[PDB]
Amino acid sequence: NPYLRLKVRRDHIIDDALVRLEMIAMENPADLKKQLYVEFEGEQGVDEGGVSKEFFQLVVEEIFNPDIGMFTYDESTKLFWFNPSSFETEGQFTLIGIVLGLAIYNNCILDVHFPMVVYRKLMGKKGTFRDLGDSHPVLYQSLKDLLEYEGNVEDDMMITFQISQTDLFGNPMMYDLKENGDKIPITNENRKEFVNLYSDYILNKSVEKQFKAFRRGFHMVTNESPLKYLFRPEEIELLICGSRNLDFQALEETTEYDGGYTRDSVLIREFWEIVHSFTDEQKRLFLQFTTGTDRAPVGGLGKLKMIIAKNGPDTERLPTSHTCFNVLLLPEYSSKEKLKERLLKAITYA
C-alpha cells in the first residue's frame, strides 16, 4: 500500500490525526516513512502535495498559538520555547513531533521558529548556559552579569540556590536547585555552579515531560537514518526550514499558469522583468507571500511549482494567494508600473 493516508476533518485535525497516527504506528511504524497522502473528510480531490501541505500549515498553526499554551513566544527573538506549565498535553507534543519528522520525509518545509537548543536536545545533547542566550535572553544577561560581577556577590545580590517559576496570575512556586537551596548563599566562589544548575533546570529539567514526548514523536519517524550522520543541529533546522536559496531563474521555469496567461503574455513577461530586478529582501518577501515562507525546499526554488493564475481584469485590488498550492492570484493590470506597485504593496503589507 503506497502512502500513509491520513483521513481527517478540518475542525478536529489534531484529534483525528493523533488517533489515526497512533494506530498506524502500533502496526508497522515503517508506514510512517512512506509518502504522506492527506484526505479531509468529505472533500473529493487528490493529494499531489498541497493537501498535505495544508495539513502541515494548520497543525503547525494551531499548536503554536498561545490559546492551547504548549509554547510561549518571545517578541524579542521571534522564537518559541516549551511551556513547562503545559498540562496533560503528551499527545499534542508527540503530534508536532511526528509532524516535524514527516515534513522532512515529504520535502515540505515548515514555518517553525525554535532557538537552536531545541535541535540540540532532539539529538540528545543537553541544553546549556550558552544555549540560553537564544531561548531566554533576559535571563542569560542576568546570569552572565552574575559571573562577570566585580563587586561582592554575596552582599550585593544575595540570591540563593533556590529559585522560582510562576504562572499566569503571579503565584510563584519555589524550586531547590541543590539540597537546602534556601540557606546556601551564592558567592563569587559558587556562582558558576549556580549558573550551571539554573541553566540545566529551565532548558532540560523543567520541560522534561513535554520535550520528551516531542522527541519521542520526532523519533517515531526518525529512527534508522537518524540525525546522527549529522554533526551539528543546524543541519536539522535546515531540513525542517529549508535553505536560503534564491535561484528565481529556474523558479521562473517550472512555473505554470492558469486563467489564460501562459509563458507568452505582456502581464507575465513584465512580471518576470520586475521580479528578477528585485532586491533579495523583496524576492524573499514574494516567496513569503506566495508560498508560506521565504526559504527553499531541497533542490532549490524550482521544486516549488508556482502557479500564476489570472484573477480578474485590471482593478485597484492587490494580488492574493493560496500558499498551500503556491498559487499567486494576479489580476491582469493595465500597466507594468502598476503591476510592480500593486505586487509590492501586497508582499510588503503582509
Binding site: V138, L139, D145
Partner: protein, 144 residues
C-alpha cells in the same frame, strides 16, 4: 522572592525623597504599593500611588511599574504603563536594587524625556509649550 527581604527591610534607612508605601495585598511580597511625592513640575502637590511588580524570577528579570493614581505625563499611558529604561530590558542588571528603580522614575516625572514618548500627544504639547502643559497638567494633578 528572597532578596525582597533586605531591600525592603531597609526602609527604616532614613527618610528618602518622595515615597510612602507598603504591601497592598499582604502575603507574598511580589507586589508593592506606594506613593511618589513629586516636588517641582506641574505635578506639584497631588501625590500618586504606584504598584511595583517583579516576577518570581526576580532579580534575573526586571520588575514592571504601573501607576494606580492617574497622571498627565508624556512618558506614561492612560493604562498606567510606565516606561523607564533602567528596568525595561536591554538595560536591566541583576544588581540594581529597587532603590534605583524608584527615584529613577521620580526623575522621569520631575523631568519628562519626550525622546520616545509613550504618547506623542502630550509630548508635542510639552516641548512646544512649557505652559499649555504645566497648566493643563497641574490642573489634572490637582483634581486626580
Amino acid at each position: 522572592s528572597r532578596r525582597l527581604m533586605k531591600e525592603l527591610e531597609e526602609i527604616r534607612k532614613c527618610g528618602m525623597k518622595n515615597f510612602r508605601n507598603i504591601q497592598v495585598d499582604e502575603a507574598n511580597l511580589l507586589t508593592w504599593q506606594g506613593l511618589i511625592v513629586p516636588d517641582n513640575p506641574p505635578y506639584d502637590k497631588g501625590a500618586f500611588r504606584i504598584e511595583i511588580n517583579f516576577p518570581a524570577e526576580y532579580p534575573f528579570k526586571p520588575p514592571k511599574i504601573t501607576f494606580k493614581t492617574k497622571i498627565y505625563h508624556p512618558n506614561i499611558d492612560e493604562k498606567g504603563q510606565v516606561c523607564l529604561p533602567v528596568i525595561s530590558a536591554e538595560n536591566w542588571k541583576p544588581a540594581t536594587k529597587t532603590d534605583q528603580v524608584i527615584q529613577s522614575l521620580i526623575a522621569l516625572v520631575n523631568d519628562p524625556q519626550p525622546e520616545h514618548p509613550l504618547r506623542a500627544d502630550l509630548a508635542e504639547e510639552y516641548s512646544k509649550d512649557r505652559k499649555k502643559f504645566c497648566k493643563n497638567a497641574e490642573e489634572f494633578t490637582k483634581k486626580y
